[PDB]
Ligand binder design. Structure first.
Ligand SMILES: CCCCCCCCCCCCC/C=C/[C@H](O)[C@H](N)CO
Ligand SMILES: CCCCCCCCCCCCC/C=C/[C@H](O)[C@H](N)CO
Lengths: 251, 285, 59, 238, 285, 238, 59, 59
């Protein structure tokens, strides 16, 4: 009941302490069909060369950590053939399987929230200003929330209670989400379909969804337990499609 | 020919009678880490009587929640002036300047509907030392310009010919004008939030102003008159109908700052109380 | 004449109305106020493996 | 022509009416409908989703995550109450900015049962039992475990299942209560006490925290729409 | 009795799936010298997926393209004056003075339809040193005169008896007047271009003014009043319906010069660019 | 009489409405309908007719026929590009005054595939091959035959059939693009290169020209009528 | 009463309207907006001998 | 068209009317003036044991 295995392409994930799997709105990923298509050229479907697990860089969960976020896509634009296909085409489409891992002993305590947010438009820490692209995303490196109000030009207002969006963070449960309670489980798994208002889109211009990881109960331990506790993310695209082949763009 | 259409009302669930219990079924023990909300009722946890519940969730459907007129723009314009631009009013269409309708719409990521648009127009005699005249009733012209259309330069510009643009002419003292507008967007739905750029190099214009592009409105007096100055105010009201919405979002906590961005000032989660145990005494002689 | 007769909203413890469409576009029709459907499981129960609620969640 | 006669109400603009109206774009051809995931049909669907409650809303914590955490610890603390609050889902500071309270503040009347879920976030080696009690109105709030013992309550045993659900059932003389609650439409209070106490082995933290979620049951409804008092402006362009 | 009429919507063609090919069929090679336009699709030249296309060509039909009101004449006239001819307005009917409607109609050689005619009438108090009076509401008379009818000489001419001519009387403050007119021409269709003469010796009047001959319009005030001077403006709007057109033509490139001729000033084919290879860079950091 | 009540919109004049209206000529007898050749039923019918494109719109040629002629010649010119332009059928100078562009400029939205036909007008003894390429947007325009080789292209061989057709297929993330195109609704570019080169015998001219026609395919449509910016006046009687 | 009931314009992925004629002349009737026919071959293919489009044009 | 035809109030010693409902809510309908029922025994005879009125009340 607690064991799980997931296979995609030439990659496989096992786990012995999982809770369940969240299918975002009861909708599994799928390819675009004919009575919903607008673009006319025949699309390419690589199908094992792109649909497989890629692992990003880890972060260190310290006693005073506000939280982390990533933007998708553009966190996977340098990951093998998925990224190469992103560079050469005008239109792309894909769903995802996200898996978050964090293990600790039966003598530690803490609680993390793992949430996927579609169209997470963010605000600037200068009210009459605008954000730079660097402030929203550093590729495979995570951005970091703050515990107090922030200053600086072109940077995101990142105090963790407002989640960079002007809402109450305790309401983020309206989105697809799981929890990692250190006494209960050690991993979270979310399956996310393609969610947009058009059937396809350009993968450089538009961030489809943001992954947020926020500790609600801080990490705590006693006398001589282990101090280093990392968190790891692993994401696999699903049902990937591309249209509009031309010469490779450059940022 | 008559055709009968049957309406099904949807009332809420009854509560079933329940007695004592001593077993291994544990409805009250759950695990929130799964992302699952518990579907327990009072009948699982206490002893209950049977109730036939007749209440209906009719007024909390999306259509009844959204189908009410709301103001979205106000502007003024004069009959005579020395600025040549204060004789007509004009603006770009959206629903981002008045906070009530904006916040209400922003509980959802995507929306699609038709609109019913109403205008309310009032006039007034400007303050002066010499008052008193005999004017005929004033007439007003409202013209809508889709993007790419020619723009008026003054109140006598040729563009007020309105050969292909839709316009409304109206006279004071009558009922407020009204017309309906279909769902007009190059996408499959309107977008309230857009986490992206306008340029393929990840710069340029950020967010909402990349996608809207739905023309302008211009309004003028028609008489071309007024020996003594006068001022008019026009207000626009929107009402959506035949609605569909997708992807709910947490409601806005911080106060709005401008109409182009989601920028905000950090705000508290709620207001405070004396203690985590504090609850006021209300039963006293 | 293409009339529609449907029931009015009333309470619980002569009740129908008639309607005619006059305009050529359906965007001119009145609001659709009498449709009451729901599907809450989309947001409250978005899990792969069904949870019975009388059984323990884990194990 | 046909003889007619105008009644009171002619030529007015009621902002909640429903009439037919001419189209300013005859025969416009709309974009086909796409089947996007996550379609919402009723606001009550949002109200049945759990959301975290800021129970620890005291001075100095209104802008930190500590506002969500209820503290508990080991030792003899049976006389100390854990928490208590009023049941006012749309008016009290504890509840008014959660998802349920946010939905309620657009309405004037509410009715139905409420769910409170409690989760224990201590180490896997901590054990304990708590008493969660709810008192209908008519008396002052209990000041000891013995008094609260007489109301509607559940005894929660911390184990491999980490979450307990206390259901507040609809006990009222009227069908609806006011969202802006007064003495006449009061609903009572909730309190928490130590049933046994928290016991831990050596090498484990001694202090821990509990969290609380709120949602609405399947008998819940609202009525009488109104504007919300949580948003405002001083001038246009905001 | 009710009678059901079924409307058939006409959507555009789908695209069919197509794979690789190596044969002697050459869909891409043609010969324009024949006067034939090639009917190739993307599926003949590349590999394609299957698409179900739901778009409709509804708003580009002739009836939807032409059935919109457009201004065709504006004129002024006074309540009191010392010229005796400035007290009424009059003109000869056509659609050649306002360029938008004219150019739109001139994409076709021949046209035939009925019309819906609307009038918009406004008034104003003339500028002066002494203002202020109490006038009753003004009334207006519009009379149409087919060719050969008697012509009014002044505002009190007997010809305003309108015994057989159709007229409209109207009062300010009410909705704009309107009436419909059938297809009235001695030919089988209206002619927009006529490459001929009026006289059998190949001289006289050239072109359009030979064939139109559709009467005049006269407009006056009815009150016969105004101790202080006032001015009124009348505007006419045309909307065709039940339309048929023949023989399409290239659209007008040069700007119009007058209403009697097709005369023009030589104009360029388009505007220039830097080079035959020039295309601007838009993907830059 | 019958009691009624007036709604908002009474007594207005909307220029796109459709109502019944009294006739000022009762029982008029119209001239019978004649069956004239060439009846038009849809504006798209005019859009599927080819028309010549002024590709060579450089300074000094805007009022001459040379604006329509693309020049080519023999010798080693493989490095030189033949032509290139953006795909903006209603906005770019190259396309806005052709029949298709003229029809589009009355509308705000367009959708569908486009046909470009190329005809070679050299002597019957000239031979050669050309590469015609189209690049969807997202990158800058190619600067060499090798880069343009990677897009959607066709290799045209000059022979007894004198005309080759390059079809631009609808590749877009939205169903419609704006007639007044911006960065967001861009569509890419077209370029031409020498695949082999032009070879001629003695006694023949060495320079030649190519012409280009544009038309719309059978999946093409427009919407959202508007006034055109190509015609204007300063006063009446024009 | 000589009513006509016909379908409204809608989209793809209660919808009909009724009309009465009041005037004695048909030139008083409203516009005919719901007729969508085409015959493009009149202008695009005006040739005597049919051209197959898979075969070469000449020879 | 969902019409109702009912009789008019007249005297004793061509008489009916028609009605159409236009609005979606029954709280918009006109008053119910033609319903005449009574139950006076609720107030005049509220006793447990029935009293015959020809017999003496007591004994
Ligand atoms: C002659 C008077 C004509 C009046 C013209 C009013 C047209 C208004 C523009 C139509 C589009 C409005 C529909 C709603 C716009 C936004 O999508 C929504 N506010 C939410 O995004
Ligand atoms: C009492 C008010 C009566 C108003 C009289 C208006 C009649 C207008 C004359 C009828 C003919 C107009 C029909 C169109 C004329 C030309 O043929 C077209 N503009 C194109 O040639």
């Amino acid at each position: 009941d607690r064991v799980r295995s997931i296979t995609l392409g030439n990659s496989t994930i096992t786990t012995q302490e999982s809770a369940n799997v969240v299918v975002a709105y009861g909708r599994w990923p799928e390819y675009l069909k004919d009575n919903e298509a607008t673009a006319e050229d025949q699309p390419t479907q690589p199908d094992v060369a792109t649909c497989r697990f890629y692992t990003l860089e880890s972060v260190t969960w310290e006693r005073d950590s506000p939280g982390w976020w990533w933007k998708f896509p553009d966190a996977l634009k340098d990951m093998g053939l998925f990224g190469q296909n992103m560079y050469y085409h005008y239109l792309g489409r894909a769903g995802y399987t996200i898996h978050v891992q964090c293990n600790a002993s039966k003598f530690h305590q803490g609680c993390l929230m793992v949430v996927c947010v579609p169209e997470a438009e963010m605000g600037c820490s200068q009210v009459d200003g605008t954000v730079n692209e660097h402030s929203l995303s550093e590729g495979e490196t995570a951005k970091k929330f703050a515990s107090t109000s922030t200053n600086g030009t072109n940077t995101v207002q990142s105090i963790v209670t407002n989640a960079g969006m002007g809402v109450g963070v305790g309401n983020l449960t309206i989105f697809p989400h799981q929890w990692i309670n250190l006494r209960t489980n050690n991993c979270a798994t979310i399956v996310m379909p393609y969610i947009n208002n058009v059937p396809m889109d350009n993968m450089f211009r538009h961030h489809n969804f943001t992954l947020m990881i926020i500790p609600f109960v801080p990490l705590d331990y006693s006398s001589d337990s282990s101090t280093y506790v990392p968190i790891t993310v692993t994401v696999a695209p699903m049902c990937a499609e591309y249209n509009g082949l031309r010469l490779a763009t450059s940022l | 020919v008559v055709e009968a259409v049957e309406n099904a009302v949807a009332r809420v669930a009854d509560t079933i009678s329940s007695g004592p219990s001593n077993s291994q079924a544990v409805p009250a023990l759950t695990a929130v880490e799964t992302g699952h909300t518990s579907q327990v009722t009072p009948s699982d946890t206490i002893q209950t009587r049977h109730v036939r519940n007749y209440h209906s969730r009719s007024e909390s459907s999306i259509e009844n929640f959204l189908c009410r007129s709301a103001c979205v723009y106000m502007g003024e314009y004069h009959t005579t002036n020395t600025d040549t631009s204060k004789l007509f009013a004009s603006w770009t269409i959206n629903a981002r300047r008045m906070v009530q309708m904006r916040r209400k719409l922003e509980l959802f990521t995507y929306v699609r509907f038709d609109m019913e648009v109403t205008f309310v127009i009032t006039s007034k005699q400007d303050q002066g030392t010499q008052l008193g005249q005999d004017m005929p009733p004033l007439t007003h012209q409202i013209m809508y310009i889709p993007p790419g259309g020619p723009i008026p330069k003054s109140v006598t510009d040729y563009t007020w010919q309105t050969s292909t643009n839709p316009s409304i002419f109206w006279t004071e003292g009558n009922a407020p004008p009204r017309m309906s507008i279909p769902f007009i967007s190059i996408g499959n739905a309107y977008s309230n939030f857009y986490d992206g750029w306008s340029h393929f190099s990840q710069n340029g214009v950020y967010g909402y102003n990349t996608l809207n592009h739905m023309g302008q409105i211009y309004v003028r007096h028609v008489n071309g008159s007024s020996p003594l100055p006068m001022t008019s105010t026009v207000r626009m009201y929107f009402k959506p109908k035949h609605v569909k919405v997708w992807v709910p979002r947490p409601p806005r906590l911080c106060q709005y700052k401008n109409a182009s961005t989601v920028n905000f000032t950090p705000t508290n989660i709620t207001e405070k109380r004396q203690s985590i145990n504090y609850i006021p005494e209300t039963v006293k002689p | 004449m293409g009339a529609q007769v449907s029931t009015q909203k009333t309470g619980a413890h002569i009740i129908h109305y008639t309607n005619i469409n006059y305009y050529k576009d359906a965007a001119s029709n009145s609001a659709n106020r009498q449709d009451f459907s729901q599907d809450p499981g989309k947001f409250t129960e978005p899990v792969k493996d069904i949870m019975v609620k009388s059984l323990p969640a884990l194990n | 022509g046909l003889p007619v006669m105008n009644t009171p109400g002619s030529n007015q603009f009621l902002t909640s009416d429903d009439f037919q109206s001419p189209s300013a774009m005859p025969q416009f051809d709309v974009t086909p409908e796409l089947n996007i995931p996550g379609e919402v049909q009723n606001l009550m669907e949002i109200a049945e989703v759990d959301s975290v409650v800021p129970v620890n809303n005291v001075e100095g914590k209104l802008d930190t995550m500590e506002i969500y955490r209820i503290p508990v610890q080991s030792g003899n603390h049976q006389s100390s109450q854990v928490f208590g609050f009023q049941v006012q889902p749309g008016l009290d500071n504890v509840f008014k900015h959660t998802l349920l309270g946010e939905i309620l503040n657009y309405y004037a009347h509410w009715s139905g049962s409420i769910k409170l879920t409690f989760v224990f976030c201590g180490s896997a080696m901590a054990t304990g039992k708590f008493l969660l009690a709810y008192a209908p109105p008519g008396a002052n709030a209990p000041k000891s475990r013995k008094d609260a013992m007489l109301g509607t309550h559940i005894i929660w045993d911390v184990g491999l299942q980490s979450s307990c659900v206390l259901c507040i059932p609809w006990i009222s003389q009227t069908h609806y209560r006011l969202v802006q609650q007064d003495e006449y439409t009061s609903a009572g209070n909730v309190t928490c006490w130590y049933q046994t106490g928290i016991v831990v082995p050596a090498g484990t933290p001694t202090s821990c925290s509990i969290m609380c979620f709120v949602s609405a049951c399947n008998d819940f409804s609202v009525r009488l729409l109104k504007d919300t008092p949580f948003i405002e402006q001083s001038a246009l362009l905001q």
